[model samples]
Target chain A: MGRILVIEDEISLNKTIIDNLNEFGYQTDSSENFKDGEYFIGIRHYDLVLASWNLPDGDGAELVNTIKHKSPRTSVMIMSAKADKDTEIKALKAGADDFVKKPLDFDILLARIEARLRLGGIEDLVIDPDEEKITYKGQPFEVLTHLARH
Target chain B: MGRILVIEDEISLNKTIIDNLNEFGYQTDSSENFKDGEYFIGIRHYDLVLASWNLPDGDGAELVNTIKHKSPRTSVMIMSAKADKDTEIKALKAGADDFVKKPLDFDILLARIEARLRLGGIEDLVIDPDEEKITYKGQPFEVLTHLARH
Candidate 1:
């Protein structure tokens, strides 16, 4: 069974994730706070972490950094209500594998997780620093940031 | 009539945009290279600049920046053959009002141009900061450099 950790502050949503993932035949665990989530990361290896950005203690990106530093193979799927196109790009730029809008859709979330797990030969499943020079397509793109008169 | 400048290395494509914009009741101008494009931007004011990433002297983003700084009201759109999700995001981040993938779809390109120009406030459509942050959908975003693997 795939090990997935759901880190959410709301008890209702946390329980829903636990119940849903269990019903779907995957092993799921949860922590409402970043500290607990960090502790869990210290003790056990997890396949994926379904995390929220605004935790009681900090943003999920911090936890994502911990996962990147300590468990690079553990996939990060950020579940956030505040996330939009720019936020998703920010999360991906911060090492997140995928960003999902919250009011969580379990089926779609599972599909994204499965896709990441199933894909092979990705040196890193997140954005590359140098790749920033290239546009989202890895082609050179120009921004007329300076041209627009403020 | 609102004047739009088309900057491209390819003569045929440059003519195509000029012809297309003219058909839509817009005054059109063409530049076949980066030097020509920059020279035009320096000498004359345009309502818009339609440019390609591939140019002779330098990258298009730099020219885009020049236009952005010189004419806050002038809209900029990038067109390229090498389009990807990452490039799209980067272009948006780089301060493009919009990005179009090439083998240039006439309908789509015109629609995008028309949409940006018609929006009533083109100056507010993009960010001008080179490194501060990008705000989209009311949330600010930042880029994280090379995340080292565990």
Candidate 2:
């Protein structure tokens, strides 16, 4: 499964994104402050990050720049209530991959995340609900059938 | 104009790509060998790269890995005659953003480049030909304006 980080100060929004992402079969971690978010980003590999433009510790654009500088492959989507052309331009110029408006449309956000994951070729390890089988990269792993332990 | 680096051993193909990219208003540089390509990538920033899988000095996959490691924002499109699904998967896994088959489809390739640039919010700079004005980030400057020397 792809890993995602959600950094939103609003507790409700953070939990919502995290829960939704988990339901979509992604491993998600959430942070309500910029410091913890920065720490998690530095210590782990996240395929995608959803970050708010305002944080208690730092600016979102600054964070985006730092993330790109540290891990270029990790895609960042900036979330902001400041939905203007200038904010979009500033975010992009600061090295964010995408910009999402606050009061986010969950469907559009999920589609964007899926598209980025596909571009990165990061496939989720999915379990077939009815079949009781695990598959990854469209290839099935037969029902825990192993040869020998020793 | 966006900068692009072209890394291909085939002389004719390299020139063809360079010509087309230049025609499209990109500032392009070409290297027939991996050593030079590596050197250029190290010194300057390029918005996009066209790399041949079979380079004389090194493996293209390794080069892609190195490029991504050093400059994550730079998008790489691997150009290969090996059009198998496995090859595509391997290249993407090795950190390439996209893949293009050899015997190049110029139109499609250009379109792919444009799309990637758009996603990255990299815009091709345009100078006003008639006005003799240079504008950057929506700020216009008068070209060759006089300044008084003290």
Candidate number with greatest TM-score: 2
Question: What is the CA-based DockQ of model 2?
Answer: 0.02
Per-residue lDDT of candidate 1, residues B1-150 (tens digit): 556666566667667666656655655556777556555554666556655554674355564455455434244655555554444444555545444566545665554455432331122224333322333221101242111110
Candidate 2 residue lDDT tens string, A1-150 = 566666667656666667656755655556777566555555665655655555775465575465555535344655555454445555544445554564555665555554443442114345452342333322201221221111
Error of 2 at A15 (Å): 28
- Candidate 1's residue-wise lDDT over A1-150, tens digit each? 566666567656666666655554545556666555545544565555665555775454565455455535344655555535444545544545444565545565544444432321122233343322222221101242222211
Per-model interface RMSD values are: 17.3, 15.3
CA lDDT of every candidate: 0.50, 0.53
Cα RMSD of predicted structure 2: 19.3
- Model 1 chain A worst lDDT window (10 residues): A132-141
Against the native complex, each candidate's DockQ, computed on alpha carbons, is 0.03, 0.02
